[PDB]
Write a protein that binds this ligand. Structure first.
Ligand SMILES: *[C@@H]1O[C@H](CO)[C@@H](O)[C@H](O)[C@H]1NC(C)=O
Ligand SMILES: *[C@@H]1O[C@H](CO)[C@@H](O)[C@H](O)[C@H]1NC(C)=O
Ligand SMILES: *[C@@H]1O[C@H](CO)[C@@H](O)[C@H](O)[C@H]1NC(C)=O
Ligand SMILES: *[C@@H]1O[C@H](CO)[C@@H](O)[C@H](O)[C@H]1NC(C)=O
Ligand SMILES: *[C@@H]1O[C@H](CO)[C@@H](O)[C@H](O)[C@H]1NC(C)=O
Ligand SMILES: *[C@@H]1O[C@H](CO)[C@@H](O)[C@H](O)[C@H]1NC(C)=O
Ligand SMILES: *[C@@H]1O[C@H](CO)[C@@H](O)[C@H](O)[C@H]1NC(C)=O
Ligand SMILES: *[C@@H]1O[C@H](CO)[C@@H](O)[C@H](O)[C@H]1NC(C)=O
Ligand SMILES: *[C@@H]1O[C@H](CO)[C@@H](O)[C@H](O)[C@H]1NC(C)=O
Ligand SMILES: *[C@@H]1O[C@H](CO)[C@@H](O)[C@H](O)[C@H]1NC(C)=O
Lengths: 985, 29, 48
């Protein structure tokens, strides 16, 4: 019986209080939506890597557990047992019963004891680094679907191996896995939600952005799908075993005075072949194999047991001082063993004539006491000269695994990867192969001599297309540079969880030049790009599902080209369009000492040795801060005179109320300016802070925002002066003294500029004025109800705030030190090591500040380019009429109006758009009296029978007289000259 | 043809990837 | 010139490369690749 775990099993990872924060933690967690074995009421289940155990009951029938490996009396086991008023925890060699519920027979050799004191009771049991950790939670309740974090209960220093466990009596058992979880802490203080990063692609995206809400778009994720790897060692087939068989089975050994010395070298010395026949000094027997030496000097001889002690470093007996003097310090392995049944001659073995003074004889019998009996000794002296080592142990080797992420060691070259055979052809002597990066990519197997091509496992992160967590939780996954037959092999979609394998196949699979897209249905309809996938493919949320499609460039439109047809506009539109340009960015100041060495004086005195780094940073940021005011001045302080509009606001029916200053408000901002001011949200604004949220955090870390020199009111005054100058004097105030001119007359000048006669404006004055008024009203309306029209200015603000928050968060990095707190380093370590740690921290934080400043300089160069463009627009669109195509709006530019926006400028471009075109026949020239006539300022058009001359941008046909054409040549050259009459007046 | 537009695989095996432009050469044409 | 090559980086792969020991030591930086990856992503979006 199995059930769904949902999101149960989260526990507090550490003992630190946190509030209103998202914290990532890599630990052992019960994965979300896991399979829990449900037992109703007591089998022995495995422990694996920790267990989650829930109990829904009302009677307290489940009140304990046993943990262990064999659960017999030959191994230590742990027993937790709740009773009427206490919990008893014991670690002993229990002999547990067949069905414990009296739970054990024997309790010998205890090690540890500890006594302390519909409902759902949840526990988490972990066994790490010798400590049994227990977390718990109790609620009053399938298993519920709420979120409830388990609090730590106890860490017990049990120090045993646990593989299986049993319950002492519904109850549910789940298994912890190594996972990263993103935890959300509340403000009143609590873990209230979590994300399982390995659950599925959306969870991977959430853990990559460290947020619980994702906006619409495509995100590159980091790999949170962790796979296990096994180890394989491959060394050369050993061969060439050292001649140790001759020193441990030779028939007759030497005599201690005439002791032998062999020079075993250039071979493999299996010392493990002993233990079947061992005091080692300056070395341990277990490391002998993985060590190497120049030449092991194997001396051999025979003595009596009483003298074996003399063969050792530091002894000074008779043998140690008169026969074989072994140094007080040396490395080697004295291997002695009784060989009485190999060296006891009857009547006396006078073959081991030992020195005492000159030299007497041992003379063993086969009846001597244990005492003085034949004892063979092999002193295996070792060497470590600088000359190359040539004596080494066997160097065992594992089997070879293929097509699995593995930790390999080929003859001393170590690395992680997947081995997949190869086609590469090494030269016979070549052992490894390297790629462009100068990193190993192929290895020849030392034993089989075949060549294996090493490839990475886990091609990394994927791209996740989301419509936004607010809208839906459906996502698509793009695997970059992969075809949709290798996706399951690429992501290893057999070791992945379910709800991840759903994104490896499923017939919702589409191939693109960017890779394989799974989870979206490719439609053949083409729309505008919503989420860009690449190579022409975009994605959108249909409504209901995610659809992929080829991007549409726009509506096709064939133009009716002809050798004699001309389309001329008969009407026009006055269009008002916006253009938002950033001008300045937040001015920032950093207290270098406060950021790097916060509240630590030793850190400050050390920081005094890193040169002028802080001075250079301060100089760079001051340059940026001054450049921001220079940008604002160059954009808005063009006019030196503060012009004012007349008290009467009649301008030929043109209504500027929406752009002109409004006295019914303290700021004197215009209505559109007020709307813009309330559409961009500032973070700090640089104004007085009175001692007593994120701004406070930044300020405490030494990061401040300085106010701009010009206030919003002064920028609004500059804008109002520009507006008054242009309304009352046209473009004259930009070139010299402001020359008054009535607004309809100025508008006639601007119509002349774009090449339409003045009458067109004087005869359509009311229509033009109403079109302009309606366009301005539409500008206001599509601003009061527009989602993000000021997205560029808000982007400037958000970028600055995000950089500052990144700086604050980078203070939690240790950069390889013991802690990120300087005070702890100084309070725990002495100067000799504190210097290393503090140098690490100071260098890391200096690098973080330098990175911040470099990014600020680059962004300031971008903002300065934008401010220069804004100043050029102000000069050429507001202070004049521009002939440059698309510089001051789409269409023939008439005029422009500036409006101050919090960190930038908005230009309202008024342009003239021809409309309601009509086809006409046209000719290059008109033949008359044998003379060719060309239009002075116009084009010849025909209504079908009659010929007129018209201005090009507005249909105003005129009789073709001699005062609107000019004569040049005869009618025998111009290709298309038409025959008609010129009315010579 | 005039601009010369295993190495890419070797890099991609080191975390570095070359993303395709959103607009294809045919769309730009 | 109008656009440059769009590139993407995965720190864990470039810095560590399948090594879990290095991957777990690289989490004590954390925001440095968030920042580097965000910079490169901004560049790629700018190319388009
Ligand atoms: C739980 O087990 C069922 C079959 O017993 C399987 O289909 C499902 O994918 C499993 N769920 C998880 C999260 O392993
Ligand atoms: C914190 O406690 C107060 C006092 O009871 C409670 O009203 C409030 O809801 C708690 N926190 C939040 C964020 O609600
Ligand atoms: C070691 O023995 C194996 C078994 O045949 C062989 O394939 C290998 O080549 C041998 N090693 C050497 C260095 O010859
Ligand atoms: C992927 O493999 C399939 C199977 O042959 C092939 O048709 C396709 O062209 C391949 N795509 C890529 C991008 O290599
Ligand atoms: C003029 O246009 C017509 C129709 O497009 C075409 O047939 C003719 O060839 C053109 N004139 C010349 C000289 O080609
Ligand atoms: C031009 O368009 C306006 C509407 O914007 C309309 O009132 C006017 O009648 C049109 N003029 C002509 C000549 O059709
Ligand atoms: C100008 O337009 C504004 C807003 O549409 C309106 O409140 C105001 O009355 C208008 N002024 C005149 C003189 O029509
Ligand atoms: C001119 O004629 C062509 C073909 O007859 C037609 O498609 C086009 O719409 C006409 N233009 C105007 C402005 O009526
Ligand atoms: C000639 O053009 C005029 C435009 O001024 C138009 O009113 C008239 O109908 C046209 N004549 C013919 C025959 O189309
Ligand atoms: C204009 O009239 C002259 C007079 O002879 C004639 O030769 C010529 O062909 C005419 N032009 C056209 C374009 O038909």
């Amino acid at each position: 019986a199995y059930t769904n775990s949902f999101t149960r099993g989260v526990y507090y990872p550490d003992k630190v209080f946190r509030s209103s924060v998202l914290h990532s933690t890599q630990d052992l967690f019960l994965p979300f939506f896991s399979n829990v074995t449900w037992f109703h009421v007591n089998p022995v289940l495995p422990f694996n890597d920790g267990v989650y155990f829930a109990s829904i009951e009302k009677s307290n029938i489940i009140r304990g557990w046993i943990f262990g490996t064999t659960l017999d009396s030959k191994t230590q086991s742990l027993l937790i047992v709740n009773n009427a008023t206490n919990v008893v925890i014991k670690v002993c060699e229990f002999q547990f019963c067949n069905d414990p519920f009296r739970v054990y027979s024997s309790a010998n050799n205890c090690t540890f004891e500890y006594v302390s004191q519909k409902n759902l009771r949840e526990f988490v049991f972990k066994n790490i680094d010798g400590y049994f950790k227990i977390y718990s939670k109790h609620t009053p309740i399938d298993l519920p679907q709420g979120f409830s974090a388990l609090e730590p209960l106890v860490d017990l220093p049990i120090g045993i191996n646990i593989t299986r466990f049993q319950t002492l009596l519904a109850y549910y058992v789940g298994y912890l896995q190594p996972r990263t979880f993103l935890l959300k802490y509340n403000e009143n203080g609590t873990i209230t939600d979590a994300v399982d990063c390995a659950l599925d692609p959306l969870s991977e995206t959430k853990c990559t952005l460290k947020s619980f809400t994702v906006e619409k778009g495509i995100y590159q994720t980091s790999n949170f799908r962790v796979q296990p790897t096994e180890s394989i060692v491959r060394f050369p087939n050993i061969t060439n075993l050292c001649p140790f068989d001759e020193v441990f089975n030779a028939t007759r050994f030497a005599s201690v005075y005439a002791w032998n010395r062999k020079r075993i070298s250039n071979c493999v010395a299996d010392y493990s072949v002993l233990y079947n026949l061992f005091k080692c000094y300056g070395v341990s027997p277990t490391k002998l194999n993985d060590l190497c030496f120049t030449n092991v000097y194997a001396d051999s001889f025979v003595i009596r047991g009483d003298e074996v002690r003399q063969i050792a470093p530091g002894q000074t007996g008779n043998i140690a001082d008169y026969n074989y003097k072994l140094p007080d310090d040396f490395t080697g392995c004295v291997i002695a063993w009784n060989s009485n049944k190999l060296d006891s001659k009857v009547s006396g073995n006078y073959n081991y004539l030992y020195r005492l003074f000159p030299l007497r004889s041992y003379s063993f019998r086969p009846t001597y006491g244990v005492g003085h009996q034949p004892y063979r000794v092999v002193v295996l002296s070792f060497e470590l000269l600088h000359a190359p080592a040539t004596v080494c142990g066997p160097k065992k080797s594992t089997n070879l695994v293929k097509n699995k992420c593995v930790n390999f060691n080929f003859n001393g070259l170590k690395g992680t990867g997947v081995l997949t055979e190869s086609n590469k052809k090494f030269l016979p002597f070549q052992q490894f192969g390297r790629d462009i990066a100068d990193t190993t990519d192929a290895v020849r197997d030392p034993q089989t001599l075949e060549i294996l091509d090493i490839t990475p496992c886990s091609f990394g992160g994927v791209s996740v297309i989301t419509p936004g967590t607010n809208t839906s939780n459906q996502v698509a996954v793009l695997y970059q540079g992969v075809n949709c037959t290798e996706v399951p092999v690429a992501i290893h979609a057999d070791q992945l969880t379910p709800t991840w394998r759903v994104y490896s196949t499923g017939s919702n699979v589409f191939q693109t030049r960017a890779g394989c897209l799974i989870g979206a249905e490719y439609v053949n309809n083409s729309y505008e790009c919503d989420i860009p996938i690449g190579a022409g493919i975009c994605a959108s949320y249909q409504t209901q599902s995610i659809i992929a499609y080829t991007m549409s460039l726009g509506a096709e439109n064939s133009v009716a080209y002809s050798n004699n047809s001309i389309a001329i506009p008969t009407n026009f539109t006055i269009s008002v369009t916006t253009e938002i340009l950033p001008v300045s960015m937040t001015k920032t100041s950093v207290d270098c000492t406060m950021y790097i060495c916060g509240d630590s004086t030793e850190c400050s005195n050390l920081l005094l040795q890193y040169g002028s780094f802080c001075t250079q940073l301060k100089r760079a940021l001051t340059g940026i801060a001054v450049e921001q005011d220079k940008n604002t001045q160059e954009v808005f302080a063009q006019v030196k005179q503060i012009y004012k509009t007349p008290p009467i606001k009649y301008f030929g029916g043109f209504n500027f109320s929406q752009i002109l200053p409004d006295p019914s408000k303290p700021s004197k901002r215009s209505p559109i300016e007020d709307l813009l001011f309330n559409k961009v949200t500032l973070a700090d604004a640089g104004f007085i802070k009175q001692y007593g949220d994120l701004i406070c955090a930044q300020k405490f870390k030494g990061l401040t925002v300085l106010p701009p020199l010009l206030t919003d009111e002064m920028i609004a005054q500059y804008t109002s002066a520009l507006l008054a100058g242009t309304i009352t004097s046209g473009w004259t105030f930009g070139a010299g003294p402001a020359l008054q001119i009535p607004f309809p007359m100025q508008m006639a000048y601007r119509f002349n500029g774009i090449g339409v006669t003045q009458n067109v404006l004087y005869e359509n004055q009311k229509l033009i004025a109403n079109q302009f008024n309606s366009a301005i009203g539409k500008i206001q309306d599509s601003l009061s109800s527009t989602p993000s029209a000021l997205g560029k200015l808000q982007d400037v603000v958000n970028h600055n705030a995000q950089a500052l928050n990144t700086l604050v968060k980078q203070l939690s990095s240790k950069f390889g030190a013991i802690s990120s707190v300087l005070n702890d380093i100084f309070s725990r370590l002495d100067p000799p090591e504190a210097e290393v740690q503090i140098d690490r921290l100071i260098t890391g934080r200096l690098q973080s500040l330098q990175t911040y400043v470099t990014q600020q300089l680059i962004r300031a160069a971008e903002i300065r380019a934008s401010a220069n463009l804004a100043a050029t627009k102000m000069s050429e669109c507001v202070l004049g009429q521009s002939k440059r195509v698309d510089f001051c709006g789409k269409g023939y530019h008439l005029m422009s109006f500036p409006q101050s926006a919090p960190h930038g400028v908005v230009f309202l471009h008024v342009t003239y758009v021809p409309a309601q075109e009509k086809n006409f026949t046209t000719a290059p020239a008109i033949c008359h009296d044998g003379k060719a006539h060309f239009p002075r300022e116009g084009v010849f058009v025909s209504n079908g029978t009659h010929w007129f001359v018209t201005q090009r941008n507005f249909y105003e046909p005129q009789i073709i007289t001699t005062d609107n054409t000019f004569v040049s040549g005869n009618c025998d050259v111009v290709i298309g000259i038409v025959n008609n009459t010129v009315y010579d007046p």
